[PDB]
DNA sequence: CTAAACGGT
DNA sequence: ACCGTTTAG
């Protein structure tokens, strides 16, 4: 029973990506604040940031 | 494409 | 929490 696949708002993405630009890795508090600000789960943001780095690493 | 899962660090 | 790799909405 898979977790239901998230669909991010344009705005969410936008602000995520903005975060990722500023900082490629977030403290736990930073993660939490962001999650709140975007009305996402810690885990939502966490996984997002991972796959994001994962893609980043595909450029570097 | 990419969010989520898996298993080992 | 993360990585790398893989699974699947
Ligand atoms: Na680090």
mmCIF file of N, CA, C and O (backbone and C1' of nucleotides) and ligand atoms in Angstrom, unseen atoms left out:
data_model
loop_
_atom_site.group_PDB
_atom_site.id
_atom_site.type_symbol
_atom_site.label_atom_id
_atom_site.label_comp_id
_atom_site.label_asym_id
_atom_site.label_seq_id
_atom_site.Cartn_x
_atom_site.Cartn_y
_atom_site.Cartn_z
ATOM 1 N N UNK A 1 0.823 -1.204 0.000
ATOM 2 C CA UNK A 1 0.000 0.000 0.000
ATOM 3 C C UNK A 1 0.863 1.262 0.000
ATOM 4 O O UNK A 1 1.212 1.791 1.056
ATOM 5 N N UNK A 2 1.179 1.747 -1.210
ATOM 6 C CA UNK A 2 2.085 2.874 -1.432
ATOM 7 C C UNK A 2 1.502 4.156 -0.822
ATOM 8 O O UNK A 2 0.299 4.335 -0.792
ATOM 9 N N UNK A 3 2.350 5.066 -0.334
ATOM 10 C CA UNK A 3 1.928 6.422 -0.012
ATOM 11 C C UNK A 3 1.459 7.148 -1.281
ATOM 12 O O UNK A 3 2.064 7.019 -2.343
ATOM 13 N N UNK A 4 0.368 7.911 -1.159
ATOM 14 C CA UNK A 4 -0.269 8.519 -2.314
ATOM 15 C C UNK A 4 0.667 9.578 -2.873
ATOM 16 O O UNK A 4 1.224 10.367 -2.089
ATOM 17 N N UNK A 5 0.834 9.575 -4.208
ATOM 18 C CA UNK A 5 1.841 10.438 -4.822
ATOM 19 C C UNK A 5 1.452 11.906 -4.701
ATOM 20 O O UNK A 5 0.339 12.275 -5.080
ATOM 21 N N UNK A 6 2.384 12.736 -4.210
ATOM 22 C CA UNK A 6 2.064 14.132 -3.970
ATOM 23 C C UNK A 6 2.031 14.879 -5.295
ATOM 24 O O UNK A 6 2.810 14.580 -6.219
ATOM 25 N N UNK A 7 1.142 15.877 -5.361
ATOM 26 C CA UNK A 7 1.202 16.804 -6.473
ATOM 27 C C UNK A 7 1.467 18.183 -5.917
ATOM 28 O O UNK A 7 0.694 18.663 -5.107
ATOM 29 N N UNK A 8 2.596 18.769 -6.295
ATOM 30 C CA UNK A 8 2.974 20.039 -5.716
ATOM 31 C C UNK A 8 2.349 21.171 -6.508
ATOM 32 O O UNK A 8 2.266 21.125 -7.732
ATOM 33 N N UNK A 9 1.932 22.189 -5.774
ATOM 34 C CA UNK A 9 1.482 23.408 -6.395
ATOM 35 C C UNK A 9 2.683 24.021 -7.096
ATOM 36 O O UNK A 9 3.818 23.842 -6.639
ATOM 37 N N UNK A 10 2.399 24.742 -8.195
ATOM 38 C CA UNK A 10 3.410 25.546 -8.854
ATOM 39 C C UNK A 10 4.142 26.324 -7.775
ATOM 40 O O UNK A 10 5.371 26.266 -7.686
ATOM 41 N N UNK A 11 3.367 27.002 -6.920
ATOM 42 C CA UNK A 11 4.015 27.844 -5.942
ATOM 43 C C UNK A 11 4.919 27.073 -4.992
ATOM 44 O O UNK A 11 5.991 27.521 -4.597
ATOM 45 N N UNK A 12 4.476 25.898 -4.631
ATOM 46 C CA UNK A 12 5.292 25.093 -3.752
ATOM 47 C C UNK A 12 6.629 24.834 -4.433
ATOM 48 O O UNK A 12 7.683 25.209 -3.907
ATOM 49 N N UNK A 13 6.551 24.209 -5.612
ATOM 50 C CA UNK A 13 7.750 23.910 -6.346
ATOM 51 C C UNK A 13 8.624 25.155 -6.305
ATOM 52 O O UNK A 13 9.748 25.143 -5.794
ATOM 53 N N UNK A 14 8.047 26.250 -6.800
ATOM 54 C CA UNK A 14 8.789 27.471 -7.001
ATOM 55 C C UNK A 14 9.638 27.767 -5.769
ATOM 56 O O UNK A 14 10.838 27.980 -5.891
ATOM 57 N N UNK A 15 9.000 27.734 -4.597
ATOM 58 C CA UNK A 15 9.615 28.126 -3.340
ATOM 59 C C UNK A 15 10.568 27.046 -2.863
ATOM 60 O O UNK A 15 11.545 27.370 -2.197
ATOM 61 N N UNK A 16 10.269 25.777 -3.177
ATOM 62 C CA UNK A 16 11.212 24.698 -2.904
ATOM 63 C C UNK A 16 12.514 24.994 -3.632
ATOM 64 O O UNK A 16 13.568 25.145 -3.012
ATOM 65 N N UNK A 17 12.404 25.083 -4.957
ATOM 66 C CA UNK A 17 13.557 25.255 -5.820
ATOM 67 C C UNK A 17 14.363 26.459 -5.352
ATOM 68 O O UNK A 17 15.594 26.394 -5.304
ATOM 69 N N UNK A 18 13.652 27.534 -4.992
ATOM 70 C CA UNK A 18 14.287 28.726 -4.464
ATOM 71 C C UNK A 18 15.102 28.324 -3.247
ATOM 72 O O UNK A 18 16.259 28.698 -3.146
ATOM 73 N N UNK A 19 14.527 27.533 -2.348
ATOM 74 C CA UNK A 19 15.262 27.076 -1.176
ATOM 75 C C UNK A 19 16.529 26.362 -1.629
ATOM 76 O O UNK A 19 17.640 26.677 -1.218
ATOM 77 N N UNK A 20 16.345 25.394 -2.509
ATOM 78 C CA UNK A 20 17.427 24.519 -2.915
ATOM 79 C C UNK A 20 18.599 25.312 -3.451
ATOM 80 O O UNK A 20 19.749 24.915 -3.259
ATOM 81 N N UNK A 21 18.271 26.397 -4.156
ATOM 82 C CA UNK A 21 19.274 27.297 -4.688
ATOM 83 C C UNK A 21 20.049 27.900 -3.515
ATOM 84 O O UNK A 21 21.275 27.852 -3.481
ATOM 85 N N UNK A 22 19.331 28.431 -2.525
ATOM 86 C CA UNK A 22 19.963 29.154 -1.431
ATOM 87 C C UNK A 22 20.814 28.161 -0.645
ATOM 88 O O UNK A 22 21.968 28.459 -0.342
ATOM 89 N N UNK A 23 20.237 26.985 -0.330
ATOM 90 C CA UNK A 23 20.896 25.985 0.492
ATOM 91 C C UNK A 23 20.528 24.608 -0.044
ATOM 92 O O UNK A 23 19.342 24.285 -0.104
ATOM 93 N N UNK A 24 21.571 23.808 -0.334
ATOM 94 C CA UNK A 24 21.405 22.477 -0.893
ATOM 95 C C UNK A 24 21.084 21.453 0.187
ATOM 96 O O UNK A 24 20.713 20.335 -0.139
ATOM 97 N N UNK A 25 21.220 21.832 1.468
ATOM 98 C CA UNK A 25 20.989 20.946 2.603
ATOM 99 C C UNK A 25 20.427 21.757 3.765
ATOM 100 O O UNK A 25 21.031 22.757 4.134
ATOM 101 N N UNK A 26 19.349 21.301 4.405
ATOM 102 C CA UNK A 26 18.646 22.113 5.400
ATOM 103 C C UNK A 26 18.820 21.513 6.780
ATOM 104 O O UNK A 26 18.649 20.310 6.898
ATOM 105 N N UNK A 27 19.051 22.355 7.802
ATOM 106 C CA UNK A 27 18.945 21.903 9.181
ATOM 107 C C UNK A 27 17.572 21.294 9.376
ATOM 108 O O UNK A 27 16.737 21.379 8.481
ATOM 109 N N UNK A 28 17.335 20.671 10.528
ATOM 110 C CA UNK A 28 16.029 20.066 10.747
ATOM 111 C C UNK A 28 15.014 21.196 10.945
ATOM 112 O O UNK A 28 13.917 21.152 10.390
ATOM 113 N N UNK A 29 15.417 22.229 11.699
ATOM 114 C CA UNK A 29 14.587 23.392 11.942
ATOM 115 C C UNK A 29 14.270 24.092 10.633
ATOM 116 O O UNK A 29 13.161 24.556 10.442
ATOM 117 N N UNK A 30 15.249 24.219 9.748
ATOM 118 C CA UNK A 30 15.062 24.864 8.457
ATOM 119 C C UNK A 30 14.049 24.073 7.636
ATOM 120 O O UNK A 30 13.158 24.645 6.997
ATOM 121 N N UNK A 31 14.182 22.747 7.678
ATOM 122 C CA UNK A 31 13.275 21.872 6.964
ATOM 123 C C UNK A 31 11.872 22.086 7.489
ATOM 124 O O UNK A 31 10.968 22.312 6.703
ATOM 125 N N UNK A 32 11.723 22.077 8.810
ATOM 126 C CA UNK A 32 10.422 22.213 9.434
ATOM 127 C C UNK A 32 9.781 23.540 9.054
ATOM 128 O O UNK A 32 8.612 23.553 8.683
ATOM 129 N N UNK A 33 10.535 24.639 9.140
ATOM 130 C CA UNK A 33 9.979 25.950 8.867
ATOM 131 C C UNK A 33 9.439 25.920 7.442
ATOM 132 O O UNK A 33 8.271 26.230 7.214
ATOM 133 N N UNK A 34 10.280 25.455 6.513
ATOM 134 C CA UNK A 34 9.905 25.410 5.113
ATOM 135 C C UNK A 34 8.632 24.580 4.933
ATOM 136 O O UNK A 34 7.735 24.920 4.160
ATOM 137 N N UNK A 35 8.565 23.456 5.635
ATOM 138 C CA UNK A 35 7.437 22.564 5.469
ATOM 139 C C UNK A 35 6.195 23.334 5.863
ATOM 140 O O UNK A 35 5.192 23.266 5.175
ATOM 141 N N UNK A 36 6.292 24.083 6.960
ATOM 142 C CA UNK A 36 5.155 24.825 7.470
ATOM 143 C C UNK A 36 4.747 25.876 6.462
ATOM 144 O O UNK A 36 3.592 25.922 6.060
ATOM 145 N N UNK A 37 5.725 26.688 6.063
ATOM 146 C CA UNK A 37 5.507 27.797 5.159
ATOM 147 C C UNK A 37 4.832 27.348 3.873
ATOM 148 O O UNK A 37 4.085 28.127 3.282
ATOM 149 N N UNK A 38 5.139 26.118 3.442
ATOM 150 C CA UNK A 38 4.610 25.590 2.201
ATOM 151 C C UNK A 38 3.426 24.670 2.455
ATOM 152 O O UNK A 38 2.891 24.090 1.509
ATOM 153 N N UNK A 39 3.054 24.506 3.732
ATOM 154 C CA UNK A 39 2.020 23.564 4.123
ATOM 155 C C UNK A 39 2.323 22.198 3.520
ATOM 156 O O UNK A 39 1.527 21.652 2.768
ATOM 157 N N UNK A 40 3.517 21.686 3.846
ATOM 158 C CA UNK A 40 3.923 20.335 3.509
ATOM 159 C C UNK A 40 4.403 19.632 4.780
ATOM 160 O O UNK A 40 4.569 20.277 5.837
ATOM 161 N N UNK A 41 4.543 18.299 4.677
ATOM 162 C CA UNK A 41 5.091 17.483 5.743
ATOM 163 C C UNK A 41 6.601 17.704 5.769
ATOM 164 O O UNK A 41 7.213 18.098 4.756
ATOM 165 N N UNK A 42 7.190 17.443 6.944
ATOM 166 C CA UNK A 42 8.629 17.410 7.034
ATOM 167 C C UNK A 42 9.089 16.485 5.915
ATOM 168 O O UNK A 42 9.744 16.878 4.956
ATOM 169 N N UNK A 43 8.607 15.251 6.012
ATOM 170 C CA UNK A 43 8.933 14.176 5.094
ATOM 171 C C UNK A 43 8.708 14.568 3.633
ATOM 172 O O UNK A 43 9.456 14.159 2.753
ATOM 173 N N UNK A 44 7.675 15.358 3.373
ATOM 174 C CA UNK A 44 7.394 15.783 2.010
ATOM 175 C C UNK A 44 8.614 16.525 1.491
ATOM 176 O O UNK A 44 9.161 16.189 0.425
ATOM 177 N N UNK A 45 8.986 17.535 2.281
ATOM 178 C CA UNK A 45 10.083 18.410 1.930
ATOM 179 C C UNK A 45 11.352 17.583 1.895
ATOM 180 O O UNK A 45 12.106 17.685 0.926
ATOM 181 N N UNK A 46 11.536 16.743 2.918
ATOM 182 C CA UNK A 46 12.747 15.948 3.037
ATOM 183 C C UNK A 46 13.003 15.169 1.754
ATOM 184 O O UNK A 46 14.040 15.387 1.117
ATOM 185 N N UNK A 47 12.060 14.292 1.391
ATOM 186 C CA UNK A 47 12.175 13.519 0.158
ATOM 187 C C UNK A 47 12.408 14.459 -1.028
ATOM 188 O O UNK A 47 13.283 14.204 -1.846
ATOM 189 N N UNK A 48 11.652 15.561 -1.109
ATOM 190 C CA UNK A 48 11.818 16.463 -2.234
ATOM 191 C C UNK A 48 13.268 16.906 -2.382
ATOM 192 O O UNK A 48 13.826 16.862 -3.495
ATOM 193 N N UNK A 49 13.829 17.367 -1.253
ATOM 194 C CA UNK A 49 15.207 17.817 -1.203
ATOM 195 C C UNK A 49 16.172 16.696 -1.614
ATOM 196 O O UNK A 49 17.227 16.946 -2.200
ATOM 197 N N UNK A 50 15.840 15.451 -1.285
ATOM 198 C CA UNK A 50 16.722 14.367 -1.662
ATOM 199 C C UNK A 50 16.709 14.260 -3.180
ATOM 200 O O UNK A 50 17.708 14.567 -3.824
ATOM 201 N N UNK A 51 15.558 13.887 -3.751
ATOM 202 C CA UNK A 51 15.501 13.663 -5.181
ATOM 203 C C UNK A 51 16.109 14.861 -5.908
ATOM 204 O O UNK A 51 16.756 14.693 -6.939
ATOM 205 N N UNK A 52 15.919 16.059 -5.332
ATOM 206 C CA UNK A 52 16.473 17.279 -5.896
ATOM 207 C C UNK A 52 17.995 17.201 -5.957
ATOM 208 O O UNK A 52 18.560 17.312 -7.028
ATOM 209 N N UNK A 53 18.668 17.003 -4.826
ATOM 210 C CA UNK A 53 20.104 16.762 -4.857
ATOM 211 C C UNK A 53 20.435 15.651 -5.852
ATOM 212 O O UNK A 53 21.398 15.751 -6.609
ATOM 213 N N UNK A 54 19.626 14.585 -5.840
ATOM 214 C CA UNK A 54 19.914 13.423 -6.658
ATOM 215 C C UNK A 54 20.021 13.884 -8.109
ATOM 216 O O UNK A 54 20.910 13.432 -8.825
ATOM 217 N N UNK A 55 19.151 14.822 -8.505
ATOM 218 C CA UNK A 55 19.129 15.359 -9.869
ATOM 219 C C UNK A 55 20.282 16.338 -10.083
ATOM 220 O O UNK A 55 20.905 16.372 -11.134
ATOM 221 N N UNK A 56 20.508 17.178 -9.093
ATOM 222 C CA UNK A 56 21.670 18.042 -9.048
ATOM 223 C C UNK A 56 22.950 17.263 -9.366
ATOM 224 O O UNK A 56 23.788 17.682 -10.180
ATOM 225 N N UNK A 57 23.086 16.114 -8.701
ATOM 226 C CA UNK A 57 24.284 15.311 -8.831
ATOM 227 C C UNK A 57 24.376 14.786 -10.256
ATOM 228 O O UNK A 57 25.459 14.440 -10.693
ATOM 229 N N UNK A 58 23.250 14.757 -10.969
ATOM 230 C CA UNK A 58 23.225 14.305 -12.348
ATOM 231 C C UNK A 58 23.726 15.395 -13.296
ATOM 232 O O UNK A 58 24.036 15.085 -14.447
ATOM 233 N N UNK A 59 23.876 16.634 -12.811
ATOM 234 C CA UNK A 59 24.484 17.680 -13.619
ATOM 235 C C UNK A 59 25.981 17.753 -13.303
ATOM 236 O O UNK A 59 26.838 17.509 -14.171
ATOM 237 N N UNK A 60 26.281 18.068 -12.037
ATOM 238 C CA UNK A 60 27.647 18.307 -11.593
ATOM 239 C C UNK A 60 28.622 17.338 -12.278
ATOM 240 P P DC B 1 14.408 12.984 -16.751
ATOM 241 O "O5'" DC B 1 12.838 13.040 -17.219
ATOM 242 C "C5'" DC B 1 12.178 14.327 -17.449
ATOM 243 C "C4'" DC B 1 10.849 14.370 -16.726
ATOM 244 C "C3'" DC B 1 10.907 14.435 -15.210
ATOM 245 O "O3'" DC B 1 10.890 15.754 -14.745
ATOM 246 C "C1'" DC B 1 9.183 12.997 -15.900
ATOM 247 P P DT B 2 11.337 16.107 -13.245
ATOM 248 O "O5'" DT B 2 10.477 15.169 -12.300
ATOM 249 C "C5'" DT B 2 9.291 15.714 -11.747
ATOM 250 C "C4'" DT B 2 8.868 14.700 -10.742
ATOM 251 C "C3'" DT B 2 9.784 14.643 -9.534
ATOM 252 O "O3'" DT B 2 9.066 14.341 -8.350
ATOM 253 C "C1'" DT B 2 9.638 12.548 -10.512
ATOM 254 P P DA B 3 8.865 15.455 -7.203
ATOM 255 O "O5'" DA B 3 8.072 14.316 -6.415
ATOM 256 C "C5'" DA B 3 6.629 14.361 -6.340
ATOM 257 C "C4'" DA B 3 6.155 13.056 -5.767
ATOM 258 C "C3'" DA B 3 6.489 12.864 -4.297
ATOM 259 O "O3'" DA B 3 5.446 12.199 -3.632
ATOM 260 C "C1'" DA B 3 7.602 11.228 -5.605
ATOM 261 P P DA B 4 5.605 11.966 -2.058
ATOM 262 O "O5'" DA B 4 6.231 10.505 -2.210
ATOM 263 C "C5'" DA B 4 5.395 9.551 -2.847
ATOM 264 C "C4'" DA B 4 5.944 8.153 -2.749
ATOM 265 C "C3'" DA B 4 6.332 7.650 -1.347
ATOM 266 O "O3'" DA B 4 5.807 6.346 -1.052
ATOM 267 C "C1'" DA B 4 8.127 7.392 -2.901
ATOM 268 P P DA B 5 6.174 5.529 0.286
ATOM 269 O "O5'" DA B 5 7.427 4.664 -0.179
ATOM 270 C "C5'" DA B 5 7.404 4.159 -1.512
ATOM 271 C "C4'" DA B 5 8.044 2.793 -1.523
ATOM 272 C "C3'" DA B 5 8.360 2.193 -0.159
ATOM 273 O "O3'" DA B 5 8.363 0.767 -0.317
ATOM 274 C "C1'" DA B 5 10.363 2.939 -1.272
ATOM 275 P P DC B 6 9.054 -0.278 0.706
ATOM 276 O "O5'" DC B 6 10.623 -0.324 0.393
ATOM 277 C "C5'" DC B 6 11.063 -0.717 -0.938
ATOM 278 C "C4'" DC B 6 12.460 -1.277 -0.856
ATOM 279 C "C3'" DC B 6 12.840 -1.808 0.512
ATOM 280 O "O3'" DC B 6 13.822 -2.804 0.288
ATOM 281 C "C1'" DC B 6 14.215 0.033 0.020
ATOM 282 P P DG B 7 14.318 -3.757 1.476
ATOM 283 O "O5'" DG B 7 15.907 -3.768 1.608
ATOM 284 C "C5'" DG B 7 16.690 -3.434 0.441
ATOM 285 C "C4'" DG B 7 18.081 -3.059 0.884
ATOM 286 C "C3'" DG B 7 18.450 -3.535 2.282
ATOM 287 O "O3'" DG B 7 19.869 -3.578 2.239
ATOM 288 C "C1'" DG B 7 18.299 -1.225 2.290
ATOM 289 P P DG B 8 20.739 -4.340 3.347
ATOM 290 O "O5'" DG B 8 22.258 -3.862 3.186
ATOM 291 C "C5'" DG B 8 22.623 -2.996 2.061
ATOM 292 C "C4'" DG B 8 23.477 -1.818 2.493
ATOM 293 C "C3'" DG B 8 24.135 -1.937 3.876
ATOM 294 O "O3'" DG B 8 25.403 -1.278 3.946
ATOM 295 C "C1'" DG B 8 22.746 -0.065 3.814
ATOM 296 P P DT B 9 26.208 -1.097 5.335
ATOM 297 O "O5'" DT B 9 26.297 0.487 5.235
ATOM 298 C "C5'" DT B 9 26.865 1.035 4.040
ATOM 299 C "C4'" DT B 9 26.960 2.534 4.185
ATOM 300 C "C3'" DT B 9 27.924 3.016 5.257
ATOM 301 O "O3'" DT B 9 28.474 4.186 4.660
ATOM 302 C "C1'" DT B 9 25.796 3.869 5.708
ATOM 303 P P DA C 1 14.972 13.189 10.081
ATOM 304 O "O5'" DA C 1 16.478 12.945 9.635
ATOM 305 C "C5'" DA C 1 17.367 14.084 9.660
ATOM 306 C "C4'" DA C 1 18.447 13.873 8.636
ATOM 307 C "C3'" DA C 1 17.986 14.085 7.197
ATOM 308 O "O3'" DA C 1 18.791 15.090 6.589
ATOM 309 C "C1'" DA C 1 19.030 11.929 7.476
ATOM 310 P P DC C 2 18.942 15.128 4.984
ATOM 311 O "O5'" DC C 2 19.727 13.792 4.623
ATOM 312 C "C5'" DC C 2 21.158 13.853 4.681
ATOM 313 C "C4'" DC C 2 21.780 12.665 3.990
ATOM 314 C "C3'" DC C 2 21.571 12.626 2.479
ATOM 315 O "O3'" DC C 2 22.812 13.019 1.935
ATOM 316 C "C1'" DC C 2 21.307 10.429 3.527
ATOM 317 P P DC C 3 23.074 13.276 0.374
ATOM 318 O "O5'" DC C 3 23.103 11.785 -0.190
ATOM 319 C "C5'" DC C 3 24.080 10.966 0.468
ATOM 320 C "C4'" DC C 3 24.321 9.653 -0.222
ATOM 321 C "C3'" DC C 3 24.137 9.598 -1.730
ATOM 322 O "O3'" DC C 3 25.280 8.940 -2.232
ATOM 323 C "C1'" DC C 3 22.766 7.924 -0.650
ATOM 324 P P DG C 4 25.711 9.031 -3.760
ATOM 325 O "O5'" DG C 4 25.734 7.441 -3.920
ATOM 326 C "C5'" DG C 4 24.500 6.784 -3.583
ATOM 327 C "C4'" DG C 4 24.317 5.543 -4.408
ATOM 328 C "C3'" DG C 4 24.200 5.761 -5.908
ATOM 329 O "O3'" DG C 4 24.782 4.660 -6.592
ATOM 330 C "C1'" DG C 4 22.049 5.192 -4.925
ATOM 331 P P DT C 5 24.302 4.300 -8.078
ATOM 332 O "O5'" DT C 5 22.881 3.604 -7.905
ATOM 333 C "C5'" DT C 5 22.912 2.437 -7.083
ATOM 334 C "C4'" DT C 5 21.599 1.717 -7.199
ATOM 335 C "C3'" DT C 5 20.964 1.738 -8.588
ATOM 336 O "O3'" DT C 5 20.222 0.520 -8.731
ATOM 337 C "C1'" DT C 5 19.487 2.581 -7.104
ATOM 338 P P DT C 6 19.363 0.188 -10.051
ATOM 339 O "O5'" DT C 6 17.891 0.103 -9.451
ATOM 340 C "C5'" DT C 6 17.719 -0.526 -8.163
ATOM 341 C "C4'" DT C 6 16.242 -0.688 -7.915
ATOM 342 C "C3'" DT C 6 15.404 -0.891 -9.164
ATOM 343 O "O3'" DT C 6 14.180 -1.467 -8.736
ATOM 344 C "C1'" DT C 6 14.815 1.122 -8.248
ATOM 345 P P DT C 7 13.104 -1.977 -9.808
ATOM 346 O "O5'" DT C 7 11.722 -1.495 -9.164
ATOM 347 C "C5'" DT C 7 11.656 -1.342 -7.729
ATOM 348 C "C4'" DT C 7 10.349 -0.682 -7.363
ATOM 349 C "C3'" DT C 7 9.188 -0.974 -8.302
ATOM 350 O "O3'" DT C 7 7.960 -0.797 -7.608
ATOM 351 C "C1'" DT C 7 9.660 1.289 -8.406
ATOM 352 P P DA C 8 6.619 -1.381 -8.255
ATOM 353 O "O5'" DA C 8 5.697 -0.147 -8.622
ATOM 354 C "C5'" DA C 8 5.260 0.688 -7.542
ATOM 355 C "C4'" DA C 8 4.964 2.039 -8.129
ATOM 356 C "C3'" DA C 8 3.943 2.023 -9.266
ATOM 357 O "O3'" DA C 8 3.092 3.146 -9.121
ATOM 358 C "C1'" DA C 8 5.789 3.195 -9.935
ATOM 359 P P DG C 9 1.587 2.958 -8.634
ATOM 360 O "O5'" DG C 9 0.875 4.384 -8.700
ATOM 361 C "C5'" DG C 9 1.064 5.202 -7.518
ATOM 362 C "C4'" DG C 9 1.195 6.666 -7.866
ATOM 363 C "C3'" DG C 9 -0.094 7.259 -8.426
ATOM 364 O "O3'" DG C 9 -0.381 8.526 -7.805
ATOM 365 C "C1'" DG C 9 1.685 7.326 -10.066
HETATM 366 NA NA1 LIG D 1 26.002 17.317 4.589
#
